Amino acid sequence: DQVRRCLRANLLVLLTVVAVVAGVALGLGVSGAGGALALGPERLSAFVFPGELLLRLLRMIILPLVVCSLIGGAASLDPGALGRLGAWALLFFLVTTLLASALGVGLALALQPGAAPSKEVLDSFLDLARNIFPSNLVSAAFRSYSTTYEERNITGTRVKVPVGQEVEGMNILGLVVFAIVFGVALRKLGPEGELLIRFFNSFNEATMVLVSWIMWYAPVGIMFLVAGKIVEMEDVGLLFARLGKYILCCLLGHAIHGLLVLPLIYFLFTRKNPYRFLWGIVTPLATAFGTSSSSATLPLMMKCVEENNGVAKHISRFILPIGATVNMDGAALFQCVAAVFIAQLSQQSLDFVKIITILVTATASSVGAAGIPAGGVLTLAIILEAVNLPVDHISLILAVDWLVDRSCTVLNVEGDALGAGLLQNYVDR
């Protein structure tokens, strides 16, 4: 029968979806029988370890993959054509992020879910600009830049001056920029750069082989990640009774943006079926929901967009690594909804100017956010300081952060893939 052949052809999709469902079921079953209280610390850690192993495996290869893929993509197109494609890509990213932020603000205002060193927003923007252009490639491979305030003048004149220091991270934005510039420079040379192009292409192909092995391992890690995240709950009833409206706002905004807005944009600009593209990219979406990080599912997204969908290699390898960092619609909607929720918690009114600042700072924060689990929580402080009325009690946002963060990751990777397909059609025209 053709059913077995179809199952064999779509074994990866079925395995990943069943892994997610079985992770949910196993988490619920273990939580019912003890809720980790009977498990204890050592058994709980042994239970949650395989998901951490999968996350480490996927983070192991992200740096060489991004660097080599971006070098190859930037060296595969003329500087004028690459510049035009990049301009269109950033225009699409900005428009989608603004739409997501506006939808989040509007939905949070409609449903009303609401009812320590500081950090200046100018310094945050300067930190983002400094992270765009790193001062040391090897140092930027494993850590980023952040500013610090200290009192160095006399005690009579106490003013905060900003000093700079390196904090732990990955600084993917500066490496992305350097890889793009290096690829453009390599194509600028003639036969001299061909050896380097072949070198980086070979390195990328080997990284893709490791990607294939790791994604074949992935479903067990996804299942254990979901099960461990579900088990760690403390008081489901009280937590839901407190944060149900906020969770509903976030999830409804994500669902509306991912099922109505982006498919409409893709259909308007392409006159094709966006849901066929979504069916092609189901597996990276399920991986993003399992791992809650856009960087870990980036290789699977590139492979699925290249193979399942008719997208050229250079277009995907140039667009997807950039969008995995700078295009974060789900994080924007999260941060806007959370800012409105926190403002309503403290009974602080928001007029037009506060809403505009929320939108702009949310776009900037989504640009600056990292593709790591709970990556959008950190820039929520930047947004709250921009509004400067919502003192940073983001502790109430947590304890439901994993699920909404997973939805944010799904929305971000979906926006990236849809933009890649739109640009592929625009190039084809």
Partner: protein
Amino acid sequence: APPPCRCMTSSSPYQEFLWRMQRPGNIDAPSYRSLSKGTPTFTAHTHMPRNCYHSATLCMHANTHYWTGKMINPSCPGGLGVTVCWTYFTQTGMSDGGGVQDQAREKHVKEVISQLTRVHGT
């Protein structure tokens, strides 16, 4: 003789989440279960690199000696500019590149050498 330690946990869960997210080698978001809750209590780390504090001093808590100091990097345990406490000795077989824990380790082993040599003499 050392002054009592004033090394409490994070006042808010967000600060603990922020400093545990930016630690070196962080791979996943910390769970809400692992975050400290309720009233703050005394806490102590079992290892601290020397490049996290400008200076360290001895403190007493429950008749036990600890090292205390102020952190200078948000990636270091406890946060940025937060007075934290750590144990007199580090973990066995572990080193922090000099610092107070190491200096205590060599001090203890040299005391052992001195007393064992005195035992040999007797």
